[PDB]
């Protein structure tokens, strides 16, 4: 139902919008997963459009609603390298973006920073 494209290949600097389209009416976050790691919540938004985003990427990123959501990638670093998600998602506080239970993930799309 959640569908992932913009990815690439990217130099140090650059930057990327990420696109998470519904098939039909739509809170959202975007996941990454670089190898060898766990996938991290990254960016999440509320149905009221509140925002959370974690602190590797906060201050580059933006995560905006539009059937879509939106995720603007600037001032891209190597450590940003990874496969990018969109699911449901909650700000779970205790702040983190955590995946709905239950959720099926998708394909995702490829980030790749390197020089």
């Known amino acids: 139902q959640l569908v992932e494209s913009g990815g690439g290949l990217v130099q140090p600097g650059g930057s990327l919008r990420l696109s998470c389209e519904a098939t039909?009416?739509?809170?959202i976050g975007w996941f990454r997963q670089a190898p060898g790691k766990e996938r991290e919540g990254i960016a999440c938004?509320?149905?009221?459009?509140?925002?959370h985003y974690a602190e590797s990427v906060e201050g580059r990123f933006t995560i905006s609603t539009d059937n879509a959501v939106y995720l603007q990638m600037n001032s891209l670093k190597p450590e940003d390298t990874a496969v990018y998600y969109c699911?449901?998602?909650?700000?779970?506080?205790?702040?983190?973006?955590?995946?709905?239970?239950?959720?099926?993930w998708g394909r995702g799309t490829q980030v790749t920073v390197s020089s």
């Open positions: 938004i509320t149905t009221r459009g509140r925002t």
């Open positions: 699911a449901k998602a909650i700000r779970l506080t205790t702040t983190q973006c955590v995946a709905f239970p239950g959720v099926s």
């Open positions: 039909g009416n739509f809170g």
